[PDB]
Amino acid sequence: MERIKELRNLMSQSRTREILTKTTVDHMAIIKKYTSGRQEKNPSLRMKWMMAMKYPITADKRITEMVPERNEQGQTLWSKMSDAGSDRVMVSPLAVTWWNRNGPVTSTVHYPKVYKTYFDKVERLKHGTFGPVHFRNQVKIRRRVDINPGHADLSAKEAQDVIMEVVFPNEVGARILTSESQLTITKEKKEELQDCKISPLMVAYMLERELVRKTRFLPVAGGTSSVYIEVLHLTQGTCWEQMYTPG
Amino acid sequence: PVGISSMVEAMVSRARIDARIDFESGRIKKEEFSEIMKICSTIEELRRQ
Amino acid sequence: GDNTKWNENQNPRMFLAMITYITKNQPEWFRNILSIAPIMFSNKMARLGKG
Amino acid sequence: MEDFVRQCFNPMIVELAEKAMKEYGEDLKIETNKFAAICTHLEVCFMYSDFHFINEQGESIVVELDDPNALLKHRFEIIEGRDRTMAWTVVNSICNTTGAEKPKFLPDLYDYKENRFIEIGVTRREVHIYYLEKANKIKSENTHIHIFSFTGEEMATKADYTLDEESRARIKTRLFTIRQEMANRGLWDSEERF
RNA sequence: UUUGUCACCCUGCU
RNA sequence: AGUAGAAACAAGGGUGUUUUUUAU
16 A cells, blocks of 8 residues: 555654644645745746746656657657656646657546536537527616526535535535435436546536536626527627527 | 644544455455554554654 | 825724724624724834835 | 542543543533543443454454454444544445444444444433433434443343443443442532633 | 866746 | 836856976
8 A cells, every 4th residue: 555655654754754743634724835936927928938948837757657758759758857846847848749649548438427517518509590680779788697507406505515425425524415306416426427537626626517506797688598698699799689599 | 624633643543444444344355454554553653652 | 087195195093983983882802803903004114125 | 630530540541531522621620520421431442342353253252462363353443532534434434335324423333243333321320211312312323222320230222232241240340440439539429702 | 367277056027 | 339217127146176296
């Protein structure tokens, strides 16, 4: 087990035992963010400036066992330097193209289900019909509209409940689920999510974005429904109007 | 995460359950359990307590 | 139109009075926690820069 | 005040108890006897767990002490001597694989003989009225339960007990001595700020 | 000019 | 010189090594 091995190797030398046995567990939230770098005021300029550098991006060290140094023609693909305050390596943007060129392949049967809320849009657009164009006045009133269908009638509490029961099962803590709808959602995701290798933060994020409701403040002139709003730039204008029924 | 215990007490408390519950309550090898418990005891001694 | 020299006037010793009015008929620890920022503002000392 | 009773028990008892009452309790009033309730509880739980390893079959044999030997799986893992972030964690991580019933309230032990939990709390006098409360509390907590008494009466569900019954008398002596000194001294069995 | 004969690193919002 | 405008840029930090010597 690499876990207990690396633990024992940490608490075998100095400088690392006192930090682990002095820092309580309600304090690691602060020292996780202890950085010596600053959030940047001008990102566009820095991107344009850094793109002409030899080694502009950073990768995990495992690269040294997954990607060569010099490719078929002889262009360097990663460097031998460590980043500022981390154990990550500094790599060139040709390594991304390489990985996409001659790299390890996997399966993609779960990527549709984890990102269902996007593929809904994708195969709802290619099943819709058009009509005439009415060039006339456009009178708009500003209202509050739900910009997401809001899968369930629930709020944040039971949302975290179902998400922790589906993603982090052995650490839900104390409580159990109560009603039928949350159990149904739970078990559906239980079955259809088995044997997934996507990062659990990504699964939790997609389930939050797929399961909770968001509302905004927008100018409307036609119909007030949720499937219409996502196509709003295209249906209404200030002088014209396109007709559309999504599928 | 919350609590007022050190970071190693927790990392050793949630390190013996995993040896006995998944790899020794499901019939996986019984020869790793030994050294797992060995190094857990070793670590909880190395802190001098 | 606009207002002129907005953050050159408006000293803290009036924020103190409006906070004392806002927090009326309230627990005492509440007022004491709500009225410390005006006190350090009215006793502040500004740096000068780089030289 | 049990800092003189500190001469009796191994310091690990107070090590665990002062850390436990930290968040929920203190030492301002009648804590060393609440410490005494806690110490009897923890001490009898540990006293069982100390020397029972399980063979191929259940019904653990009593085992010599300080002995690196074949069987290490002790029948009862201690859940009471942990913080919530480990107690709830272990009750979940049991209720999931080797499916059991995670109880609506807190557990104390879990074995591999009957594959269920154990409740081992104590009551001072006759339990004819408080087993009722205990029953309306962890309702149908389908893990073996067994109340106790500060005099020595014992009984439980299923009309079956845990293991060898010399420990019956040995816990009887545990309790008997505890009160003995109790009777010797105690009346045994009588907003924020800123 | 100098007690010299020549090298070496680092950094580009700190 | 030039940039530039109420004050700057025209680079900024550390590491070396040491009583006259015969030859290519």
